[PDB]
Amino acid sequence: MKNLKGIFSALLVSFNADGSINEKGLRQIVRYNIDKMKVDGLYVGGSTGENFMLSTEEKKEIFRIAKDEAKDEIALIAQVGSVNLQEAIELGKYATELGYDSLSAVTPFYYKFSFPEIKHYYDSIIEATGNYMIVYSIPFLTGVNIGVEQFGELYKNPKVLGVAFTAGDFYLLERLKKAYPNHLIWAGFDEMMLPAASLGVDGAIGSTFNVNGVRARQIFELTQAGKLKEALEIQHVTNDLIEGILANGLYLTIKELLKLDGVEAGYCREPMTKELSSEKVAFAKELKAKYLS
Amino acid sequence: MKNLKGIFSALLVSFNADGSINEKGLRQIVRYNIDKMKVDGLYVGGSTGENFMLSTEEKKEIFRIAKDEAKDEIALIAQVGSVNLQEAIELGKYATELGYDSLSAVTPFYYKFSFPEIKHYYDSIIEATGNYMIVYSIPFLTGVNIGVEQFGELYKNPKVLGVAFTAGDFYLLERLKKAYPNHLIWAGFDEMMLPAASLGVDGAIGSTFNVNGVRARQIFELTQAGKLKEALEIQHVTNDLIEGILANGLYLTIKELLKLDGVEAGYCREPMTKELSSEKVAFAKELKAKYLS
Amino acid sequence: MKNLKGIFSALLVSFNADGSINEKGLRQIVRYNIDKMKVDGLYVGGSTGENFMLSTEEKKEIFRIAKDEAKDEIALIAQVGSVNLQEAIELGKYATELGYDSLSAVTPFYYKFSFPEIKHYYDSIIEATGNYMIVYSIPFLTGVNIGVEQFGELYKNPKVLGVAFTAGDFYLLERLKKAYPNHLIWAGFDEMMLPAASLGVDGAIGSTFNVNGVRARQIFELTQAGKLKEALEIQHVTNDLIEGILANGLYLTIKELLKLDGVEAGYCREPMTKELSSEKVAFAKELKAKYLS
Amino acid sequence: MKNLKGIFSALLVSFNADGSINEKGLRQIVRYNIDKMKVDGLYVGGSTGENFMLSTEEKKEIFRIAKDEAKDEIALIAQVGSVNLQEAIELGKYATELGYDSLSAVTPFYYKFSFPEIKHYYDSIIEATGNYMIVYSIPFLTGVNIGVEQFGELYKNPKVLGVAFTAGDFYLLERLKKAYPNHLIWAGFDEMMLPAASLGVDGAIGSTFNVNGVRARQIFELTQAGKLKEALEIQHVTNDLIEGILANGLYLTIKELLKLDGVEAGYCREPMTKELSSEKVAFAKELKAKYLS
Numbered sequence A, B, C, D: 001m002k003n004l005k006g007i008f009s010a011l012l013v014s015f016n017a018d019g020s021i022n023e024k025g026l027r028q029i030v031r032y033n034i035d036k037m038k039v040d041g042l043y044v045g046g047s048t049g050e051n052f053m054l055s056t057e058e059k060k061e062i063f064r065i066a067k068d069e070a071k072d073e074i075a076l077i078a079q080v081g082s083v084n085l086q087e088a089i090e091l092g093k094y095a096t097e098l099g100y101d102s103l104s105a106v107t108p109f110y111y112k113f114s115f116p117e118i119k120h121y122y123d124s125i126i127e128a129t130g131n132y133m134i135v136y137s138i139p140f141l142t143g144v145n146i147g148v149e150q151f152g153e154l155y156k157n158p159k160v161l162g163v164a165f166t167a168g169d170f171y172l173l174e175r176l177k178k179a180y181p182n183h184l185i186w187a188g189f190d191e192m193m194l195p196a197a198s199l200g201v202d203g204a205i206g207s208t209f210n211v212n213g214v215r216a217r218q219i220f221e222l223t224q225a226g227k228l229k230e231a232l233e234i235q236h237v238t239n240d241l242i243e244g245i246l247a248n249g250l251y252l253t254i255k256e257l258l259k260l261d262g263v264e265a266g267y268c269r270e271p272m273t274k275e276l277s278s279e280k281v282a283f284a285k286e287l288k289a290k291y292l293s
């Protein structure tokens, strides 16, 4: 398998005003991430891709386009999970047929699934697809917390590579590295990249890398090299940008910052707010002038 | 329009071992609720229907079968909500064409939608379908809390009838009746039916009414009649049953109790546990003998 | 032992601007509750008494004054709990010597005590004082949740009489009445008095009964009588008042409403806001005119 | 003022079986921290000192003994906060008279204090004592969350030096350093020392430094020097020890580990479990052999 370490943008998708995928803009976002953000890979179909608001056919179309555009130039991870295991299997087979390097799956949500249910969900997608699997943990959205011993159970399936860790529990993080030193962790919070990197995460997956992937890689590499003073300066500027993005509307503002570099990054999909008001456009432009010029 | 007050079973769905819908079993469930449980209506496609684990086609087939079977004998509400607004619109159109008496929609979940996004979601479904709408509030699963003022904003759409209140905040409940006296509330927690009835809810939507509809009606009517001593005895026996069902696995145990009365209620849908372990099958038989014999 | 059923005001305390106790005002509060509010008893030293902001000497002086004033006319319960078990013991001894009819104690808070630590705390107070004990449950402030089985363990001490249930879990409440039919429950949320009464609570302990004791008795007795239409009207007016008091500052506004009836209810104790801002003084006068005139 | 940067043990207190302070053992704990753990300073009266279970007289006695034993050899910070502002002022004057280098105060808890109330509490202790003030933030115990802008308001009082940050929000941490670069942060979670240090905290306050202060200082210094690989090894061993301590009972196990080096660290104070069972003694000894031999 391709090396799955380093910087992965969580791929945003270009939507038309009616909510349909804009293929031309999606291809532009892919190309911008490869050529300009110089990412190691793309995480496709995650929360950033507005995935959970889309139909099965739409998720396939995104997987097909992203893989057609990226070809073999970078690593590609397909997030196929949802509350629907039969959909996760179907998407998982599809992305596997398309040559995606690993699958990833959000812990099933909404219903209060027991841990054995959650494990069986992972084991079923793996068995049905035969592909690698990255557990996607995002407690602040799912309300699901997985402990060290529970991760170990998940890791008994030798196709589980590790965890996309969109959590802030740095004690849990350190304990997962100690217990399962050969399993990978990708840090999911961009605004906490430096401290996650200081504990030896193997890479990161983030929304803001679609526009700030140059700083993200510096923070990651500089931390790993022990150049903490410099990584901290770059985290500080990054977090001024991120604080601004979050204040303005995270997905719409990253898209606006893409548009300001000529990427037809499109609308967001309803029920998210579909377009930035003119005041927030002006705000995004200030962020561009201050941080990305 | 049909009277939507009174006792609504939240319809359970009969699944095959492979997760496909068993139509024969699903019709037996609908018939049993109408003929034996004597419900006023069915709430179709909600959390009890295992709706969120299903594909769009499957949710349509369920709406079709339930309406095929029940025809015009009882009231029918279609829960069409989800994270996917375009799916909610499609399902609302379909259910509206089938002649469902109102739609209902879960507050959109997973992402942290703002209240104006949540309102637009309701107003969009309504506008696209032309049908009545019941707001579906289940904070314990969605993490969405709507205040009295926010319900007022929702209720400015005159096709919003009120709320399926799967919530235990009885201060909120009394305040909604005070502020919006002409808007309906259906209580969603069967184990707190009596106190909710004491505050003048217009009916109730419940998973356990599929097997305990006789008692539930009694609690409701005895409470509305001011016969609280008797209502309370029956709530106590009902809650001995409910406590048993919760410890044994909520939806599986309701299904097993149906099966024990000859209703082919089938399996649950993965990634919920698909069948009861053997000792839990036996526990279910003991609840049948103690409470539903 | 005195009958401890019925309506208990949670006693407010009159403070001077410097935070010292105003005895004259505190006696006026006790008299007003007995003579005008017609309470069955007072719950002295609980959260409404601003007890947790006070020194040991101050908590004794309050117990002394309240018992001095009320003598034997009404029932008297002393809340002596805290994080400090040795203080709870000292206060329980003192209150027991004064002739308080039962002690009560808050679950110990701040630290995350285990259930066996929590049980030992109750059993220690009981053993040292020889007096009856009411468990004081207020999860919204302490973060401590006690299950039915845990209450059973507490109730194995035969001097535990039941629970001051400042909690909204009406499933839990019905289950406690089912499992421990001879143990008492006092409802703690005044704004949900009616549904709690519908489940057979033995009385209620309330901050707002210091000014709204006439209505509260009515809701309680009308509900116990099965006259729910009338109980509900009075709960609605009571909750218009309570909503006003909460928005305006709970304890200050109850004190201002006392003051407006000539009861010198004094200041609140820092670090609570010591006095109402001027516009809030005026808001309190408008609640008086609307609801307590 | 003495330099307040670096490693501060949160001082444990030796109690007798009856709950009284054992002065001889308290002096031994102080001396062990100065001479053997080589701490920069002691944080006296915090959660680790079992402070919130003690009387005012007892808190004074601890302050008096700790200061008499330490003299001027290290920095000393006195945690004087509680729900009782008048007690916090009294303790604050006392510790100030004794020559404590700064005061610190927990955000007032139990009651849901507003932010202006919290700020006035800090401003009152400062004004009454004239001493420096370190805000003590421990959300997981108090339930109080203070945002960046709210910290800025607190910092408008030029005697506030910064924050003892017993929180895990490393985004908040990074933002406080960016907004208030001259204000100090002490990290409060020992098991997350390395990532807190990687963001430039100025020191740490922790329970486990009373026994692991040699490793703690290596992790802190090595991180600051950019020797991340080595600091991570030492954090890994430290966290094996800490995981064990927490599993066994945190305060009793640190005390047991002190006893195994000849410190008469005493009992814990009720309502905490007062003594370790013989199995947990044996467990502590294994921790000693594995990590502290």
Ligand SMILES: O=C(CO)N[C@@H]([C@@H](O)[C@H](O)[C@H](O)CO)[C@@H](O)CC(=O)C(=O)O
Pocket (backbone or CB within 6 Å): A010, A011, A043, A045, A046, A047, A048, A049, A138, A166, A187, A188, A189, A190, A191, A205, A206, A207, A208, A242, A250
């Ligand atoms: O909640 C989110 C927003 O998508 N998490 C993302 C994080 O980058 C935040 O956006 C960022 O740190 C600001 O909070 C990230 O983990 C991307 C992702 O997980 C996905 O596409 O599934």
Ligand SMILES: O=C(CO)N[C@@H]([C@@H](O)[C@H](O)[C@H](O)CO)[C@@H](O)CC(=O)C(=O)O
Pocket (backbone or CB within 6 Å): B010, B011, B045, B046, B047, B048, B049, B138, B166, B187, B188, B189, B190, B191, B205, B206, B207, B208, B250
């Ligand atoms: O979460 C649930 C279980 O589906 N809520 C249901 C409730 O009956 C509980 O099962 C019951 O009180 C046991 O706790 C109910 O409100 C039905 C419903 O909401 C739906 O199907 O959408």
Ligand SMILES: O=C(CO)N[C@@H]([C@@H](O)[C@H](O)[C@H](O)CO)[C@@H](O)CC(=O)C(=O)O
Pocket (backbone or CB within 6 Å): C010, C011, C045, C046, C047, C048, C049, C138, C166, C187, C188, C189, C190, C191, C205, C206, C207, C208, C250
């Ligand atoms: O938290 C409170 C306010 O002290 N609880 C009180 C309640 O009356 C509320 O104030 C009321 O329902 C408004 O929400 C009450 O249970 C009295 C009490 O517990 C005590 O003093 O210990």
Ligand SMILES: O=C(CO)N[C@@H]([C@@H](O)[C@H](O)[C@H](O)CO)[C@@H](O)CC(=O)C(=O)O
Pocket (backbone or CB within 6 Å): D010, D011, D043, D045, D046, D047, D048, D049, D138, D166, D187, D188, D189, D190, D191, D205, D206, D207, D208, D242, D250
């Ligand atoms: O909750 C605690 C336990 O006292 N926090 C302490 C932390 O060291 C933990 O004990 C440690 O990281 C393990 O969780 C620490 O911040 C000491 C302290 O704050 C105080 O004395 O007030």
